[PDB]
Design a protein around this ligand. Structure first.
Ligand code: SF4
Ligand code: SF4
Ligand code: FES
Ligand SMILES: [K+]
Ligand SMILES: [Zn+2]
Lengths: 114, 688, 126, 86, 48, 208, 95
């Protein structure tokens, strides 16, 4: 059960890194919208960041959340410098996929997905 | 312990006396090459592939036959062992025809694999090969004896396990042919298994021939449902299409064999399927209709009922999941008239205790028995692998078999006591020598067939057999671990439905007729439109449309046993699960999914969505259905015997005639087999 | 020191990058594959295989090729024994069904049994 | 509106089911003679705690734990279940 | 080929064809296999 | 065994075994195993926490002088609990030899980087993070170098499927290249090519 | 000898022909359905049977190394002609 830490000694430091990453992303959402000529509002991008942060908010391991913070830093560095395209930023906002069924009756009508 | 010490490649290992060199090398962990030796057949020793060298001995011994001795060092990979193997491969491939690209064994051939990994890589044979004329033994084995190597597994299987004694070796020397010497149609209940035990491509599955290839197939483990044995099989498919069915290895059920019906029901599984819901039009002709309209019609006609006006009949190929789903759905409408096709007597204990409707010991318990008394059954065609197990105990364990019924062939010698059921009344009172025969037995066994319980006096026969079994169990030398009362079944959906609390037999429907009938593949025709009122809303839920589908009002297509994950319980109470090999064709879905969608559209939604919740419900209603490959013992035969002694039922003097007498009535049993071309060809071959 | 203590179950569903629907709705199967009964070699039943279920494979509108939608339809993993397979299945959050291996019973083969004097094991032909 | 079926899950070897076994060993027989049309399904397994499932009308189900019960306690349990009738 | 003619066969085309793409004689792909799974045809008799 | 069999060299095998004993005796803190293959190639298996104090020795000792970093590879073996097998390949020009240094790591365990010893690893292990997910501590510039910018998941892990989870197509509705769930026109036909007979007797593992 | 289904489509030697209600026939409009007019069975049917002077006969398909692997055919039966596995040629005995 004894493991080697990377950056976060405990859960408090990992939560500090998470808050720092969210601060940076909330800072850089308007510049990402303006620079890439994205045709969405700032609120859509900021609540997308909030949705992703709440989606990945089930982890209790310091190493896993530390690696999540590192990968968010990679995404932030690829966004702050113009290395992505319009499509790479817009891939988060799924606009071409039709809404999949969720209730049992509609999925029973469509196919064999359990 | 008397385990002597031997050496394999300088490493010590302890073996029981009588252990062969091959068995010792297998125990260490090297699989010795072989062609004629089989672990479930008698030792022949006539291919010399297994020749290994023991050190300090100037001769190579046959590892498949020669027993080991103390201090023997088996040089498994020395020089002369490899020289002997290379010489044997050269002799074996000296006369073999260049037929690999036209062969059906290519890619799954023992000769090719052993030739690459043990034999040489070039041929010194500069002469002409032999050419043996082909024969025919039926429409189940394509026969090319040019490729036979005279390994003599055919004769040993046909004499020891199948027990028909028609195959043989005619000739002397290089002109010896493995045939029958006449135009004889070799047809048994385990014929196709010879295709599994040909190491070359001499014998080929005829319906499978020239259709697929082993390296492009996907193997999916599954459970056989055509009988109540519960054989474990592997279905090999090719790009979402079932290609062939092979036996699995399970030492307690189906060791490495299957019946021919299991082997050749697939081509009828891919014919006459239901691929779309059908509802009645204005005229009354069944026409295609989407899922929503049919489900809404069924829900509308179902919400108008309350009480005993809806029923349910379950066919022979229904899993426990759909059974419990329909049970919950009809319990929401508060109907307890849930019925099965096959009749079992509920007088006395009935289906409450588990001990009086299962093969109580095991399938393998025949190896621990010495006296077997079959009552009114034909186990050669009902449970063929159980009959094979009885024959194996007859051969090795020196069994003592008897039968009370019609004089039908059982591929061995039995004691025909007559077809009168009153003979049973003789055994309980000691007025027969067979009563003393059972009395001096140590671990006896009484097996009662399911087909003897489908008459009008099944309860009396069950009471008599139970009285006999409980008389032997207490008065004679039975320790207490041994179980005497067994019942052999013939329907894969009978034990699972009886474990869930279904009412066996269709007599409940015939007592009070309902205004709506549910059929889960009930093609047996237990009830018709003459035993039903004028306006009956019959709903059919099955894959094959054979009998109950033309008379149905709303047809709901379902999934076959190879097309859904299904929980099945065999005749000994063991629970097993199948796996999805190919998705159902067209718009057909799984049966419990259809029932759950119907309940959701009717406002009576069941509290399960996926398969694991249905299995949790199954564990709630009966835990033994969710413990897979685990048999649980059912005690309290004494309580069932006490409860069965009150209602004295009168017997019938008619002979105990099983419905299956010859092989011509064995191929056509279920819906899958009745819509098959191979089965029709087999029937045409055996009746001509 | 340079070491910390983590007392939670290893769950790396968030770092493997797999979508959600291929995590909770997929039932893995850990088993020892059965020997092909057409052959006699037992080398293929030496290591444990972890596989997945089979989804739909429909026909192509052009020539009826096997068109599929499951990306995990050809994923077969090999593990040395059962415990590492169970640990890997529970590490990625995959609900698993485990089947125990079926070792064949060591038989008692006797060549002399075909030539008995007072037993039924006398062979009819050789 | 009534009781439709009774189910008794128990174990074969665990001592916690032992008194429940005694019920089937001593007082089941005439109990089946008491009710000619009430299915009392007895289910024995390997490592399951004792339970009593009683199905009422229109799909209602009641669960009563039967762990570590004697013969008289389990007799009172099935008597209360039979006397519920709801 | 004026001095070394090819061997004559019964299945060799007597006239050569150029690239037929873009013309009404162009090649289109199609499956060469029949129906895999048959369908249960309902009976035409009245159900009564 | 002359014409079709590879010749065997024993002097090189003896010298490589002697150098392996030399290395395993100089560094007993981190070196776990030393093995010489049949085709005369040395392999040193050490602890991960001794990646850096070993390698600089092999770069700076006068008796080793392994001045070149040829290849740096991670191998995924899902059986072990440390599924990633980091492999350093070193080349010595003064002594004209090649050595292999092997170590292990799991997903969440960081490994000390080697850019302080060999600068070529400044790219190499970076590609490892792009392909497997092994995090390297104190890397100067660690970012994905082979996969797409928005790609999630590490493709060279054996649990990752052959075809990916998303496929790209142009869309006139949004005038953009979008990613959709993967739907192949033909399934990748999986072939069972393993012969069920014993391959080599000399590589026979002991049974259970 | 191609047969004509009454939907207008020619039938291949494998027996495949699209039904009249099949929508996939719209792939053939404005274009042509390409089918080989040299049927293999109707071209091997008229090849004569060769009488040999021995019990068994070896077939390689002609050309030596340009044909199929050499297979030996037994002509012990006096009812059916021994047909080659690869080439489809059939031999017999004059007795
Ligand atoms: S039996 Fe085996 S070796 Fe003989 S032709 Fe067939 S594939 Fe080839
Ligand atoms: S046909 Fe096959 S199984 Fe039968 S004797 Fe010949 S090689 Fe053996
Ligand atoms: S396996 Fe022993 S001689 Fe055939
Ligand atoms: K065969
Ligand atoms: Zn030929």
């Amino acid at each position: 059960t004894s493991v080697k830490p990377i950056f976060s000694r405990d859960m408090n430091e990992a939560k500090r890194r998470v808050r720092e990453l969210y601060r940076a992303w909330y800072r850089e959402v308007p510049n990402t919208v303006h620079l890439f000529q994205l045709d969405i509002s700032v609120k859509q991008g900021r609540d997308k960041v909030r949705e992703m942060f709440k989606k990945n908010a089930h982890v209790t391991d310091p190493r896993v959340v530390d690696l999540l913070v590192i990968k968010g830093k990679m995404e932030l560095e690829e966004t702050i410098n113009v290395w992505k395209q319009r499509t790479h930023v817009m891939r988060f906002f799924h606009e071409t996929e039709a809404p999949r069924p969720k209730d049992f009756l509609s999925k029973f009508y469509v196919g064999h997905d359990p | 312990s008397n385990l002597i010490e031997v050496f394999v490649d300088g490493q010590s290992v302890m073996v029981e006396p009588g252990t062969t060199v091959l068995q010792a090398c297998e125990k260490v962990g090297m699989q010795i090459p072989r062609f004629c030796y089989h672990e479930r057949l008698s030792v022949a020793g006539n291919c010399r592939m297994c020749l290994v060298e023991i050190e300090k001995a100037p001769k190579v011994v046959a590892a498949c036959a020669m027993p080991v001795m103390k201090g023997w060092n088996i040089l498994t990979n020395s020089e002369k062992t490899k020289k002997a193997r290379e010489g044997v491969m050269e002799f074996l491939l000296a006369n073999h025809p260049l037929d690999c690209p036209i062969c059906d064994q290519g890619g799954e051939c023992d000769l090719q694999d052993q030739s690459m990994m043990f034999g040489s890589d070039r041929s010194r044979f500069l002469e002409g090969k032999r050419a043996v004329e082909d024969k025919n033994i039926g429409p189940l084995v394509k026969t090319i004896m040019t490729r036979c190597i005279q390994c003599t597994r055919c004769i040993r299987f046909a004499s020891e396990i199948a027990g028909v004694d028609d195959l043989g070796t005619t000739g002397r020397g290089n002109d010896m042919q493995v045939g029958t010497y006449i135009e004889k149609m070799f047809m048994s209940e385990l014929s196709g298994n010879i295709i599994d035990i040909c190491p070359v491509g001499a014998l080929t599955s005829k319906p499978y021939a020239f259709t697929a290839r082993p390296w492009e197939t996907r193997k999916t483990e599954s459970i056989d449902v055509m009988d109540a044995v519960g054989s474990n099989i592997v279905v090999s498919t090719r790009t979402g299409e079932v290609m062939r069915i092979l036996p699995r290895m399970h030492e307690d059920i189906n060791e490495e064999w299957i019946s021919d019906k299991t082997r050749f029901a697939y081509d009828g599984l891919k014919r006459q399927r239901l691929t779309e819901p059908m509802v009645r039009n204005e005229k009354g002709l069944l026409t295609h209709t989407t899922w929503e309209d049919a489900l809404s019609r069924v829900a509308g006609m179902l919400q108008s009922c309350q009480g005993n006006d809806v029923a349910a009949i379950a066919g022979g190929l229904v899993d426990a999941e759909a059974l419990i789903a329909l049970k919950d759905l009809l319990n929401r409408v508060d109907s307890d008239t849930l019925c099965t096709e096959e009749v079992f007597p509920t007088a006395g204990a009935g289906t409450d205790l588990r001990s009086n409707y299962l093969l109580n010991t095991t399938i393998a318990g025949v190896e621990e028995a010495d006296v077997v008394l079959l009552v009114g059954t034909n186990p050669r065609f009902e449970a063929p692998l159980f009959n094979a197990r009885i024959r194996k105990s007859w051969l090795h364990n020196d069994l003592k078999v008897a039968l009370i019924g019609s004089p039908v062939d059982l591929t061995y010698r039995y004691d025909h006591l007559g077809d009168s059921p009153k003979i049973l009344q003789d055994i309980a009172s000691g007025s027969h020598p067979f009563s003393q025969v059972l009395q001096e037995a140590k671990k006896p066994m009484v097996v009662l067939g399911s087909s003897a319980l489908q008459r009008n006096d099944g309860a009396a026969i069950l009471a008599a057999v139970s009285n006999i079994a409980q008389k032997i169990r207490t008065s004679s030398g039975v320790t207490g671990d041994w179980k005497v009362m067994n019942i052999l079944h013939r329907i894969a959906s009978q034990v699972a439905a009886l474990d869930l609390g279904y009412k066996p037999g269709v007599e409940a429907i015939r007592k009070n007729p309902p205004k709506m009938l549910f059929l889960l593949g009930a093609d047996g025709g237990c009830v018709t439109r003459q035993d039903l009122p004028k306006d009956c809303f019959i709903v059919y839920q099955g894959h094959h449309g054979d009998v109950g589908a033309p008379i149905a009002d709303v047809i709901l297509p379902g999934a076959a046993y190879t097309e859904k994950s299904a929980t099945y319980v065999n005749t000994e109470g063991r629970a097993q699960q199948t796996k999805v090999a190919v998705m159902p064709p067209g718009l057909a879905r799984e049966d419990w999914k259809i029932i759950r969608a119907l309940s959701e559209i009717a406002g009576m939604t069941l509290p399960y969505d996926t398969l694991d919740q249905v299995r949790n419900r199954l564990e709630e209603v009966s835990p033994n259905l969710v413990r897979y490959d685990d048999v649980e013992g059912a005690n309290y035969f004494q309580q069932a015997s006490e409860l069965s002694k009150l209602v004295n039922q009168q017997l019938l003097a008619d002979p105990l005639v099983p419905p299956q007498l010859t092989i011509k009535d064995f191929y056509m049993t279920d819906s899958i087999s009745r819509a098959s071309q191979t089965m029709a060809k087999c029937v045409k071959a055996v009746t001509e | 020191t340079q070491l910390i203590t983590v007392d939670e179950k290893l769950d790396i569903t968030t770092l493997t990058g797999v979508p959600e629907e291929h995590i909770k709705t997929r039932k893995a199967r850990i088993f020892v594959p059965a020997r092909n009964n057409m052959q006699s070699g037992v080398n293929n039943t030496k290591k444990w295989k972890m596989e997945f279920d089979t989804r739909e494979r429909w026909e192509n509108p052009l020539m009826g090729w096997a068109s599929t939608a499951d990306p995990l339809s050809n994923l077969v993993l090999t593990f040395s024994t059962k415990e590492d397979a169970i640990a890997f299945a529970e590490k990625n959050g995959w609900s698993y069904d485990v089947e125990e291996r079926k070792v064949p019973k060591p038989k008692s083969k006797s060549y002399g049994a075909n030539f008995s004097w007072n037993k039924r094991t006398r062979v009819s032909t050789k | 509106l009534g009781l439709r079926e009774i189910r008794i899950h128990l174990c074969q070897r665990s001592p916690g089911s032992q008194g429940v076994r005694d019920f089937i060993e001593k007082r089941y027989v005439e109990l089946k003679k008491a009710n000619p049309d009430l299915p009392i399904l007895i289910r024995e397994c390997s490592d399951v705690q004792p339970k009593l499932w009683a199905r009422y009308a229109f799909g209602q189900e009641k669960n009563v734990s039967l762990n570590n019960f004697s013969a008289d306690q389990v007799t009172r349990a099935l008597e209360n279940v039979l006397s519920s009738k709801a | 080929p004026t001095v070394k003619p090819p061997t004559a066969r019964k299945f060799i085309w007597t006239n050569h064809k150029f690239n037929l793409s873009g013309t009404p004689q162009q090649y289109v792909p199609y499956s060469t296999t029949r129906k895999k799974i048959q369908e249960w045809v309902p009976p035409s008799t009245p159900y009564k | 065994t002359r014409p079709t069999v590879r010749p065997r060299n024993d002097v090189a095998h003896k010298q490589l075994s002697a150098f392996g004993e030399y290395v395993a005796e100089i560094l007993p803190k981190y070196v776990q195993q030393v093995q010489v293959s049949c085709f005369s190639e040395l392999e040193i298996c050490i602890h991960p926490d001794g990646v850096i104090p070993v390698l600089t020795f092999l770069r700076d000792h006068s008796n080793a002088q392994f001045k070149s970093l040829a290849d740096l590879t991670a191998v995924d073996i899902p059986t072990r609990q440390n599924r990633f097998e980091i492999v350093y390949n070193l080349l010595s020009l003064r002594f004209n030899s090649r050595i292999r240094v092997k170590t292990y790591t799991d997903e969440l365990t960081p490994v000390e980087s080697s850019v302080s010893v060999y600068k070529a690893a400044n790219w190499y292990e970076r590609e490892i993070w792009d392909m497997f997910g092994v995090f390297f501590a104190n890397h100067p510039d660690l970012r994905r170098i082979l996969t797409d910018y928005g790609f999630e998941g590490h493709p060279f892990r054996k649990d990752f499927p052959l075809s990916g989870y998303v496929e790209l197509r142009y869309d006139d509705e949004v005038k953009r290249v979008v990613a959709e769930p993967v739907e192949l026109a033909q399934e990748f036909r999986k072939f069972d090519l393993n012969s069920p007979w014993e391959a080599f007797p000399a590589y026979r593992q002991p049974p259970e | 000898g191609v047969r004509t289904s009454p939907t207008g489509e020619k039938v291949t030697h494998t027996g495949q022909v699209y039904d009249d209600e099949d929508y996939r026939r719209v792939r053939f409009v404005g274009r042509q359905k390409e089918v080989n007019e040299n049927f293999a069975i109707d071209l091997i049917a008229e090849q004569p049977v060769s009488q040999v002077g021995s019990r068994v006969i070896s077939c390689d398909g002609g050309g030596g190394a340009l044909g199929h692997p050499r297979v030996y055919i037994n002509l012990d039966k006096e009812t059916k002609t021994g047909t080659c596995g690869y080439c489809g040629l059939q031999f017999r005995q004059q007795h």
